[PDB]
Amino acid sequence: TQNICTRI
Amino acid sequence: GPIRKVLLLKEDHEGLGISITGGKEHGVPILISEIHPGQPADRCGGLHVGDAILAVNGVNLRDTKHKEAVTILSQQRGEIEFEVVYV
């Protein structure tokens, strides 16, 4: 856990 | 690939319609993970999944952690000019 995808 | 400049418009109530991943702490660019249907990026075209976002409205994203890039991208309003390259 550390890479994420963030919606903007 | 070649660096491209792509401008879209975002109303205040809208999102950009993209998801990003990556960042300095993971040793990779800010990358477009997804382009969401019907939102500004999809309606404009010219951005692609796997593009690195090098800058937005002249604000450099090449050395930003993921959280900082989220902050920067989320703060853009109106005209949003992306500098992108397919990595």
From Swiss-Prot, chain B:
Superkingdom to which the source organism belongs: Eukaryota
Subcellular location: Cytoplasm; Golgi apparatus membrane; Golgi apparatus, trans-Golgi network membrane; Synapse
Transmembrane segments: none
Domain PDZ: 5-87
Disease named in the record: A chromosomal aberration involving GOPC is found in a glioblastoma multiforme sample. An intra-chromosomal deletion del(6)(q21q21) is responsible for the formation of GOPC-ROS1 chimeric protein which has a constitutive receptor tyrosine kinase activity.
Domain notes: The PDZ domain mediates interactions with FZD5, FZD8, ASIC3, GRID2, CLCN3. Also mediates interaction with CFTR and ADRB1.
Functional summary from the UniProt entry: Plays a role in intracellular protein trafficking and degradation. May regulate CFTR chloride currents and acid-induced ASIC3 currents by modulating cell surface expression of both channels. May also regulate the intracellular trafficking of the ADR1B receptor. May play a role in autophagy. Together with MARCHF2 mediates the ubiquitination and lysosomal degradation of CFTR. Overexpression results in CFTR intracellular retention and lysosomaldegradation in the lysosomes.
Name of the protein described by the UniProt record: Golgi-associated PDZ and coiled-coil motif-containing protein
Organism: Homo sapiens
Parent sequence residues shown: 284 to 370 of 462
